[PDB]
Amino acid sequence: TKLTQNVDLLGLLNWRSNSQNIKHNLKKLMEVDGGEIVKFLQDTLDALFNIMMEMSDSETYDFLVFDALVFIISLIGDIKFQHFNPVLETYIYKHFSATLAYVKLSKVLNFYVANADDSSKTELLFAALKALKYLFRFIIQSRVLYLRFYGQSKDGDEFNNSIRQLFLAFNMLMDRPLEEAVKIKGAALKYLPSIINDVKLVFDPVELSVLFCKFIQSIPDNQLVRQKLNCMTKIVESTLFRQSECREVLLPLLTDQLSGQLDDNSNKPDHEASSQLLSNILEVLDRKDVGATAVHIQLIMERLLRRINRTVIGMNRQSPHIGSFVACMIALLQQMDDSHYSHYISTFKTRQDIIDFLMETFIMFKDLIGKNVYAKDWMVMNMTQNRVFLRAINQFAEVLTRFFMDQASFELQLWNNYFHLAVAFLTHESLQLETFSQAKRNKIVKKYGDMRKEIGFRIRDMWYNLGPHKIKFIPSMVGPILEVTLTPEVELRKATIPIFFDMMQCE
């Protein structure tokens, strides 16, 4: 476990006397075995730093050493080599002693990205794309080491610049024709968001946000849809916990790309990745102490609901992962508050437009409750979505009231649809269902109450409020009110039968 079989390594150990073959040894490093390396890799790192504080004037050696360490870390990525990382970070954060190397390293990266069209530099590029996370971690450590060693950076600004220009070269690669490096472009988008949680330390988070923003617009906007979605997933994942000052600026970009995903009619395959976004975004929104988001959920509401309803009427087919999108929209309006329904979801364009939107939503709810997308074993989340339907459909009852009694002296037909939903929802989850156990009864009751009670009371009181237009309704609507009157409970049945006498007197 100490004995080593290699000449390149050993000569580099006394590179101080092998000051000549440093170039040669470096040219010979690409075939040094991983086992040969791992024994004293950190020691190679220290010798490497000695080289870089001394012989930086051989920026040829900067390239060579750079690719050598990239080869080292790419080696380290393997399952055979996942295990040294504790030693790695220990050295990086206890014995790493490089101060200005990070400048040189970012510099070499910028060279490589600049010289990207060269096929000989392509693989060095792509390997660096793989190792970006460690590369940046080391550049962080070297930079902050320079910082403490010098107290502060008189020129940290030009460092931030280094970041920006390097980003710009990246941007123009994405502007460059795809056929050059389509693979490495995907690899880029994949591995860049690694660096951001380390960018946190030494940077303006808003600037990083807008950086990746510009990056995203730089995409050829008919390519790498799955790839870009996974990338932006890794973005939304991290540093969105540092919410307010990246949320607000990333978010519009996020909506742009997902709404491009919305309706192009090539949209069909990305469904999965769109679902991941939709999910992660709003669930971290519900992640409590990330910050205040009611406005933010408000925005997402505004410009994604009619969208997603259309979507899942198109995602309609039961066989696919439609249910995931269901989870999305429910959780949405679950978190999202009544106020926000009132905000603009109440406040759409010319009235008949919102009327059409509502009728679509209702016939969707009918498509949901009838033919639930669930195997009846997820009754937990099933009951929950019952709750959110309860709440949302309530709020829709109130909007239809506040805008659609005889103040709108007319336009009273849609309520047939309405009450169909009202009952069809009411038309399951009955006494025998809880009867599966007493535990089943009481679990449902304690956790949830008896939703049927207030469902009935809502239909009841809105029936009262329906006004003398009831005459337009009775003979048709008499169907459903028997289901509710037949409801196996006691109370709401007592509150429900009088409806008979009510339209009895109206007629």
Swiss-Prot record:
It comes from the Eukaryota. It is found in: Cytoplasm; Cell membrane; Cell projection, Podosome. The modification N6-acetyllysine is found at K190. Interacts with CRK and CRKL. Interacts (via N-terminus) with tensin TNS3 (via N-terminus); the interaction increases DOCK5 guanine nucleotide exchange activity towards Rac. Interacts with ELMO1. Guanine nucleotide exchange factor (GEF) for Rho and Rac. GEF proteins activate small GTPases by exchanging bound GDP for free GTP. Along with DOCK1, mediates CRK/CRKL regulation of epithelial and endothelial cell spreading and migration on type IV collagen. The DOCKER domain may mediate some GEF activity. Belongs to the DOCK family. This is Dedicator of cytokinesis protein 5. It comes from Homo sapiens. The chain holds residues 629 to 1135 of 1870 of the full protein.
